[PDB]
Amino acid sequence: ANKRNEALRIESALLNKIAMLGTEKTAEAVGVDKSQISRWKRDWIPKFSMLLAVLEWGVVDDDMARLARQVAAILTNK
């Protein structure tokens, strides 16, 4: 349900940030030869992408956002 959808939520922001930076730089800025990394995404990012989801890494994120753009509400609105 949510521990799985929200894990994949992270598999996705993770893959996306590789993408952004460069599959290349995000791979020599962080070990793992071209061939190994990428087809590593296949099997090992999904795994510790659940992990983050397990730590609620979301609520903190989301809460750090809820509160953020909630205090940005005494600004938006008063």
Next chain:
Amino acid sequence: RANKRNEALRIESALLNKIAMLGTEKTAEAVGVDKSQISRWKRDWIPKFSMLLAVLEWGVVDDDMARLARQVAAILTN
């Protein structure tokens, strides 16, 4: 004169701070794990991962940095 090194460390902290705090309470499916548990896993891919997370400039939230946010945020929210 650290740029990435440090954060791969700041991040890596709060992680094994949670893979023990909530850790092998649920962490074998949380990451679908070998015969059974392995923190020998963690020293394998958590440090690399923390790097990635750092490289990806992924999140932050120091645990007592949050609290302060929250408090300030509550102070600014009444």
Next chain:
Amino acid sequence: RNEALRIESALLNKIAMLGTEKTAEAVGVDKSQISRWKRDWIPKFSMLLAVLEWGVVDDDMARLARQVAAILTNK
């Protein structure tokens, strides 16, 4: 249950300000304990101070609330 709670909230923000890790180090508490610290000891001492009608209050957690108002309140 008393303003012991109020006090707890204070001490924790101070610890947070100064830094949970620097503060454990500066105080006795080693990273091993920091939780016990925050979950038995802080609350318990907070009662004592409440009972002791001690008081010491969050002025510093003010300067922050407002000092985050300085930067955020302007762009």
Next chain:
Amino acid sequence: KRNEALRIESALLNKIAMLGTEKTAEAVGVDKSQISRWKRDWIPKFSMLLAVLEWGVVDDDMARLARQVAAILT
């Protein structure tokens, strides 16, 4: 100095006495055979916390906090 802690434990132990070394240990909770073990490791540590928490955490210290505390509150 950091016998600032001593002056604290001192003032704490005074308020305690001045109020009741039991009217107090129940006001907070805890009894006689442990009530004595309380005076010594606990009060001092708390005094030390109080004395640490009583260091300046100066301006620039207050700035890096106020900065990133707010860097997340946006």
